[model samples]
Target chain A: RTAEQSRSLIVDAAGRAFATRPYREITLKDIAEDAGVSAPLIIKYFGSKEQLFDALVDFRAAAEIVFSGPLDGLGERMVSMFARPLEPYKPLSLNILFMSGPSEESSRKLRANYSAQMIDALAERLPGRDARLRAELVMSMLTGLAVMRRKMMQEHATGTPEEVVAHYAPLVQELLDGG
Target chain B: TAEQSRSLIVDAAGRAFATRPYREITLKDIAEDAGVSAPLIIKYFGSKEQLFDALVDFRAAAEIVFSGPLDGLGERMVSMFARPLEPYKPLSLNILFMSGPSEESSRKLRANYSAQMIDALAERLPGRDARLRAELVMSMLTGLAVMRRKMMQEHATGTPEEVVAHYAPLVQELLDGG
Candidate 1:
């Protein structure tokens, strides 16, 4: 009904669509159908498919996991926040990595914001290399492990969830301290 | 001009362009230069794009490399991937080729790779839900392999490849240790 409400509705549908289908398979028509709106209305609110995607990743419900605490507890906060976009619902890393690309707009929109925020957080934890490197190290480790975890789940399916989480948390902390 | 020339051209061009993306290439260009009629190109390969896409996903059963616990998977990975970037391995070339292609290509490649690893790894592990465990193992290793490759590309400041080797034991602990 309202502008923000309408866009939120569409993005929720879009994220759901993306969870199962590749970005290309999704069309404005599909989103409109899924959201119970017309195709034109979907475009009217979101501008372009790419912008809609940017909005989805930038959307708080779809992406960000804000951790509330002091700077010191940030490490724990980091682990929890990183865990949000994974598993039984969204393979957030796989989704993002699938959509990730070389376009100036896509790169800046998709990775840059997340990258900047992550590195800044890492810098707060251990202030040395600029936020970017710190972020890259941390994000890469998280993403890599996430990918590896997903791979293992599909391949072996042995470890309990807690076992998997407990397994990676310290390794992540180690990277944070060293990087 | 002739059927033999045409097939040879398609074979060569497919391999060459399979190593890259669709937008990066041109069909008519690859065809005419190949000394074949463009229509004949369609006859043999369906379409230039089809020809290219087929070869792009050519490997149905690529080997699954695992170093296990004592082998130090992390360091082994760095050592394995380093060769590609060091002088540019062909396998690495496919990886570079696959980056940021269309969503279809990306999804296909991801699913294909995922399925391959799952099948290979699942066959070996004995567990209650081997299929599900196989997926987790694939995801973890996928993350490690891709992240390692990403770092090698950017050349940024962070943990040195050596430090990242700590992951081998950690991964082994996850895969083997109770």
Candidate 2:
């Protein structure tokens, strides 16, 4: 497989592993095996277990996608992405669903990156008296939903994806407007 | 003490779990706490592990707090948490713990807190999407209760009632379909 393809595949496997199990229990070889690649290969692309996790939780790409379209309808788009996140695009907030991770650093890493990548970036696009403040509540809504997935998966999963978006998008869109 | 002998035994177990290492805590010491026999403790709870895991949950504080129509529900709801970001109130034990140190902990929390609270709110709400709306509201509330402390610390831009004025609208949006 190509370098990028292999990295993508490795990350996919890593997300599943970390989501299903605790951070300390997961190993590079376990991820490597899950990805169908050698451990050495995973090490080459991503140096250590910590490095691999950093890549898995990065929110930069997800932020870009959420902000891809025009600002006007971006709320629906962001809501849609969370409702039925496109493949290989797990919500950044899911990483923090269970804050009591194996280590403090994992929690710290995600919080810092999420703010920089998603919240601060979105603040720049907003237009209002409290652009940054609004951006946070808006982003918190997304993270809250992601965290809610773990807390209420079966109860809420009953709704169709459209139903999920239809009900929740306007709230997010309101924040996007910054009015 | 005789009539409520069984509860005393479990309470004894509770002290053991809280005080020291699980391995070091002896059934005898628990028996000593509740003034019960070691065998009685086993008979009541079957095993130490069973008694241990069965411990902890919370009382219903949401029904009253969540009362009222969607028109001003956000203001009421956000107000409850806007003051202190330390951690949410006694929100049905183990919700924040999340699997704690064991998988069984995760299942019990989801089954208890997840099912009970959301369904309770869903019943009061209106719309075919009432349940969906309820989840988003709960989600945002959880964010503010938990992340409010985390995010509110980062920067200063209307961190006080300013947040409530801005945040309540978002809650109302989810509640009333804005």
Candidate 3:
């Protein structure tokens, strides 16, 4: 396989491993075994385990589909962007938040990258003053909401995903209303 | 020395130390020394750790005051109920017991009891949606309780008083949210 193909395969394997286990519990050896590549070869391609994990984080963030339209109701629209999906990526995203150190360079770098992505997306949609601040607010609230709602969803949730969406619509409205 | 006063202080100190770390006290040794019979201390309370845990349960009942008239029970009793600095002594004990790795020592019931206890305590609040608020209070409190406990394990960050203070506003927010 070409280096590009091999790199893609390794990233895919690493992301899968990460999504399945907490970051601390996962091993480079396990990823290499899963990818059917030698451990040394995996390191040769990715350089370090942290580098591989960071690549996966970026990939998961990119995979989330974003939406756009009128800026008039962009807040709810922004909320709906996250509300619609309960994808495999959510757990991975949460793991990053929960386990990533507040002071670590890797976490700071990842957060900065996330902030940049939000700025780009929100500026395109809202196009106004303090757009970056609004994005940060929405992101923090969304993380709390995700942690809260996801707990509810994991436990005692028998409703359809649509029902869950309907249930949480007002919460989204409340946060957007900035109450 | 007065027997009643010495016993009372030991009891109080045992309770106080249970709600906090070993390094948190200086007066306990002095209190025990003044009480006389350090062997009597071991005989009565077992070890320092046992004394501390017993004090925890005792403190939980003492610190978290939730009494009230059941009339207009929701707001008067539930919503306005506040946990002063030591409110969650039972919670600390619950978490330490919960940190056990065994399946049989499952903290699930402890989590459930934590909820049930809050609901029982909130029986004093009054309103149409008071019951709902009570449930959510249980959720938020238990969530914060466990979250703060987890922070202690990982960060060793907050002192007992600091943990209570850090989580108090979140409790207030949950109650005030409705």
Q: Which one wins by TM-score: 2 or 3?
A: 2
Candidate 3 per-residue lDDT over residues A1-179, each given as its tens digit: 88787777787778666654445667889988888777888889878888887776573355244434444554455445554435333534443533443335655555555545543454334444444333433443344344333332234223333443343334333333332
lDDT of 2 by residue, A8-65 (tens): 8898888877765557778988988999999999899989988888887788987887
Give the Cα lDDT of each candidate: 0.50, 0.66, 0.45
Q: TM-score of the candidate numbered 1?
A: 0.57
lDDT of 3 by residue, B1-178 (tens): 4477557656556444433334444454635544555555566666655554454342244234344433333233222222222322334333222222332222343343434454454454454444444444444343333232221123223244433333344334444434
User: Model 1 segments beyond 4 Å from truth?
Assistant: A1-5, A16-27, A39-50, A59-97, A100-104, A127-137, A144-160, A177-179, B1-64, B67-69, B81-140, B145-156, B159-169, B175-178
How well does each candidate reproduce the native contacts, as fnat?
Answer: 0.32, 0.51, 0.00
B106-139 in candidate 2: lDDT tens per residue? 4665665555677677777766677777777877
Put down candidate 1 lDDT per residue, B1-178, tens digits, no spaces.
Answer: 4568766765656544534444556666677667666676777778755765555452443352553532454355434432323211233223333444355654455555556655555565544555444544444444444444432245334454543453444444434434
Query: Which CAPRI level is candidate 2?
Result: acceptable
The DockQ assigned to candidate 1 is: 0.23
Task: Order candidates by lDDT, high to low.
Answer: 2, 1, 3
Question: TM-score for all predictions?
Answer: 0.57, 0.75, 0.47
Instruction: Tell me how far the alpha carbon of residue A27 in candidate 1 is from the true structure, in angstroms, after superposition.
Output: 4.7
Candidate 3 at residue B42, lDDT?
62
